[PDB]
Amino acid sequence: ICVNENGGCEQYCSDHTGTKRSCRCHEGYSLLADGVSCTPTVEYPCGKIPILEKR
Amino acid sequence: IVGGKVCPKGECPWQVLLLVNGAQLCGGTLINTIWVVSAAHCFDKIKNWRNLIAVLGEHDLSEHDGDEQSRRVAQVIIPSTYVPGTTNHDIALLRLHQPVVLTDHVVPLCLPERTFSERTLAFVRFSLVSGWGQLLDRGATALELMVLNVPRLMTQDCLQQSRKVGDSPNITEYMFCAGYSDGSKDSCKGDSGGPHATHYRGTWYLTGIVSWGQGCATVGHFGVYTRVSQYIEWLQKLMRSEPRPGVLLRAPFP
Ligand SMILES: Cc1cc2ccc1[C@@H](C)COC(=O)Nc1cc(F)c(O)c(c1)CN(C)C(=O)[C@@H]2Nc1ccc2c(N)nccc2c1
Ligand SMILES: [Ca+2]
Incomplete structure (x- = not known):
């Protein structure tokens, strides 16, 4: 599942027994109830540009 | 750059x-x-x-x-x-x-997980390379930070698009080519160590490190980057x- 279109995950993907898939997030992010999206939990999350984000 | x-x-x-x-x-x-x-x-x-x-x-x-x-x-x-x-x-x-x-x-910048980097980021065509390196081959270095968008090549394609030159080092599985062969755009020796950053679903990740090449932006040659994955x-x-x-x-x- 993770091999195709990142298993629908925004960030990381873990494959499990059968057709089970778990999305995960880098530190400073939390996974939303959709199970795919990652949202910042800190003021300066990695890989995000504050001057562009604030615009 | x-x-x-x-x-x-x-x-x-x-x-x-x-x-x-x-x-x-x-x-x-x-x-x-x-x-x-x-x-x-x-x-x-x-x-x-x-x-x-x-x-x-x-x-x-x-x-x-x-x-x-x-x-x-x-x-x-x-x-x-x-x-x-x-x-x-x-x-x-x-x-x-x-x-x-x-x-x-x-x-x-996000250091990605290996799986994510190999199965997803490695297929994002363009990435950004940056630094205060040479603005031209045998030219002055930059005073303001420069950035350039480069396409990634498959290693077979880098070797088929490169100009046949002797004593050239091989491109190992711990490297990847990116850039242009027409001598117009490349990272340089003064950009060494700098990021090759890949955008995916609204976040940037570390995919490569400015590593080597032959003379900045030389016709028939691409930049070579450390494969961070x-x-x-x-x-x-x-x-x-x-x-x-x-x-x-x-x-x-x-
Ligand atoms: C590893 C390396 C690095 C460079 C050149 C050759 C080599 C190998 C073969 C031999 O190894 C070396 O020459 N190692 C080496 C050791 C040092 F301490 C240095 O100061 C230095 C190089 C200076 N220098 C020429 C470098 O950094 C240069 N960098 C780039 C970086 C990116 C480049 C790009 N995208 N397009 C074209 C040229 C580029 C050169
Ligand atoms: Ca300054």
Whole structure:
């Protein structure tokens, strides 16, 4: 599942027994109830540009 | 960087400037408040490890605007398989003596997981390469941070599109080609150690390190980058380790 279109995950993907898939997030992010999206939990999350984000 | 543009101030906030005795040495990438990823070859000629400084929040080298943060480098970690003066395993992990403070102008780039990097990021065509390197082959280095968008090539394609030249080093599985063969755009020796950053679903990730090539933006030649995905586990283990006396540390790879 993770091999195709990142298993629908925004960030990381873990494959499990059968057709089970778990999305995960880098530190400073939390996974939303959709199970795919990652949202910042800190003021300066990695890989995000504050001057562009604030615009 | 040849054939790019000035990176607007604050748009490459993970870019590191490495200095030795205040002189421009190399680039680097901040991956959290304590650690920087650079290229091993940057340190081949260091004699006094105590005069190595990392600067974050840098943009214009001619002026201090107050966003710059300087830190002494407490450790330089290089894989045991790297051989000075050669191309393979061109990566260094640097530990700052004191963490940098994250601000609008100093933000880490995400070090991705290996699976994610190999199965998803490796297929994103274009990525950004940046630095204060040469603006032209045999030309002056940049005063303002420059950035260039480069396409990634499959290694077979890099070898089929390259000009047949003798004594040329091979492109290993710890490398990848990116850029152009028409001599118009490339990263340069002064950009060494700098990020090759890949955008995916609204976030940027570290995919490569400015490593080597033959003469900046030479016709028939592409830039060669360290394939960061091969080192994720090696980097994660080291980031969990206690500092060791002495600046330089050679760590077993794998
Ligand atoms: C590893 C390396 C690095 C470079 C050149 C050759 C080699 C190998 C073969 C031999 O190894 C070396 O020459 N190692 C080495 C050791 C040092 F300490 C140095 O100061 C230096 C190189 C200076 N220098 C020429 C470098 O950094 C240069 N960098 C780039 C970086 C990116 C480049 C790009 N995208 N398109 C074109 C050229 C480029 C050169
Ligand atoms: Ca400045």
